[PDB]
Subunit: 224 residues, 3 copies
């Protein structure tokens, strides 16, 4: 199309699609029940992202929100993606460490709150209030990060969890910043650059994260 | 009303309602925990369908989508039904065979993708792109069917699973065809006939499927 | 704002926010896995309510629905809250009594139906039909109440469950009445009083319920 961000949406669609196919093929033949869980979660994540990238590319997942006296292009489909994919990603971490159910519920619920309030902020027509939602969403993210560090095994489990926790902190923490400087927030970075940034983050957080996880012996039960 | 498809919506509402009441009464008194799971899942399915049929009958679950240069009546409430009822139905099959959690997640997630992309296709304003969504949704359905045949007990469990798997393949595979030839897709069959077809499919896939399942000794633990 | 109900929305936001913070601090340090489940569920409930109260206060969670020949202010965000918080509350009760999974699914599903049909009724443009949805929603509520009394331990578990079941029946049963007499239904009580009533009910059903639950020894495994 003639939205300059189309190229990043197209590459995102492609990389999510290819990552989905790769993980699908890779998990073919896996019989270990524990490993199956990780393959399922980890393949579902970019498959969902693929659909939502495509919806943005085709224009379905874009709406105009009036605020600051303009009609502002907001890609709402990102939140529909994140609503499902972010708890899934947290579930991969939580299963790695054999987290308590209470802890999993805390994580999933805080994540739901993070995404839902981010969506509310994204669609809010009173400019100043958009940042209230951003702050609440960010608080939920900080709670999530706190639990990953202070709320929790085989040495390979510890090692893989540590690496993935670090990837998670670094990549996830960038999202509120991009939103804040981008078209959803202060509008200091144009939508095409914002789209590029989220594409790099998303591909790393999904396909990159998944490559790290699915390469590890941590996803298998200890078997002779 | 004066929408000619009202009669099929009314009969669908009635048959789902009656099926719900029948399963409710039938599962009264069931104490076996395994059987309770099947009664719960299986009664919930037509209860949800009853609500969404009624919403279509009353006109709430209908919207107009512009495409191909017309205002096209799209019953969106079907997807709200299917979003919940189709994974529930898959859950009945998966519990019958004591499926791995990874496999259940794969099934539920692929199903979510099937329904969500079908909804996107149903609401998409660019005619040609509607069929892209249809294709992606169909791929998700084919993945689901593949898992039911290649991804998986007491002989009565095997026997009941086999029958229900066959019912599932035959009925579910008809949905993409009806959508394709109907008002959502190529518009070769009118909405009133499309509605009739989905009504027959839905009642069979829910109340018919449920009668088969709930009549079986497979839903009970092996007890003396 | 100049909506007279703003004061009740503001106090609701505050009390849910404070209740969230209190439960969060209170559950700090809890290591018992069973207790963690209850703290997680019970803190998530007012955290979600806090977000949805704030959304109503800020005006995001309000829409106008034409019916009875007027444009009627309907707070839809209540349903988005209840959709998540009501099954969570039922989950607290069900975990207390170690409910069968079938029973939990029945409860959660009936609750989903209660809330979804209440939302449909709230948004329905044909006045008389709003009450059809109300009736169906009420039937789902009555099913839920029936299960809590007829569908189900350590003496402290029994004692706490009994108290919380009674609180639940009394408070939950008031909701259909308020809706019926309020702006969503017959319009005999003005929106500002309706808002006050739901605020008192919600705070009691969430923060009050939670204080009772989290003060009990019932939420802990039996340990030496
Ligand atoms: C698609 C997959 C192939 C895996 C093969 C193995 C073996 C940064 C990404 C963006 C800009 C381009 C990141 C990570 C890798 C993503 C691929
Ligand atoms: C409603 C139930 C009664 C069950 C009694 C037993 C005993 C095809 C359906 C449509 C067109 C009419 C199908 C299956 C049965 C559905 C009833
Ligand atoms: C916020 C919490 C503090 C708990 C401290 C303990 C110790 C009726 C409510 C409304 C009108 C005001 C009710 C229940 C208590 C809610 C607080
Ligand atoms: C695969 C995609 C992922 C891992 C996306 C993660 C996204 C977030 C952590 C987003 C966080 C946000 C906030 C913390 C504040 C408001 C804006 C959001 C939703 C971008
Ligand atoms: C009770 C209702 C059920 C079992 C409905 C099943 C529906 C489907 C399998 C629908 C599939 C579709 C596609 C595969 C492609 C696009 C259109 C859909 C959603 C009708
Ligand atoms: C924390 C909030 C809670 C516990 C809310 C409970 C709400 C209900 C039990 C609402 C019930 C309703 C009906 C039974 C009929 C239609 C209207 C509703 C949704 C208010």
């Amino acid at each position: 199309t003639g939205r300059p961000e189309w190229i990043w949406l197209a590459l995102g669609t492609a990389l999510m699609g290819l990552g989905t196919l790769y993980f699908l093929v890779k998990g073919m033949g896996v019989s270990d029940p524990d490993a199956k869980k990780f393959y399922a979660i980890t393949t579902l994540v970019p498959a969902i992202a693929f659909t939502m990238y495509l919806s943005m590319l085709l224009g379905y997942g874009l709406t105009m929100v009036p605020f600051g006296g303009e009609q502002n292009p907001i890609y709402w489909a990102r939140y529909a993606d994140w609503l499902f994919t972010t708890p899934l990603l947290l579930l991969d971490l939580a299963l790695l460490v054999d987290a308590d159910q209470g802890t999993i519920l805390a994580l999933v619920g805080a994540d739901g709150i993070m995404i839902g309030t981010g969506l509310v902020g994204a669609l809010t027509k009173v400019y100043s209030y958009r940042f209230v939602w951003w702050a609440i969403s960010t608080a939920a993210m900080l709670y999530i990060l706190y639990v990953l560090f202070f709320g929790f095994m085989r040495p390979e489990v510890a090692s893989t969890f540590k690496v993935l926790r670090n990837v998670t902190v670094v990549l996830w923490s960038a999202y509120p910043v991009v939103w804040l400087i981008g078209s959803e927030g202060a509008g200091i970075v144009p939508l095409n650059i914002e789209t590029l940034l989220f594409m790099v983050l998303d591909v790393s957080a999904k396909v990159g994260f998944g490559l790290i996880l699915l390469r590890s012996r941590a996803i298998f039960g200890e078997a002779e």
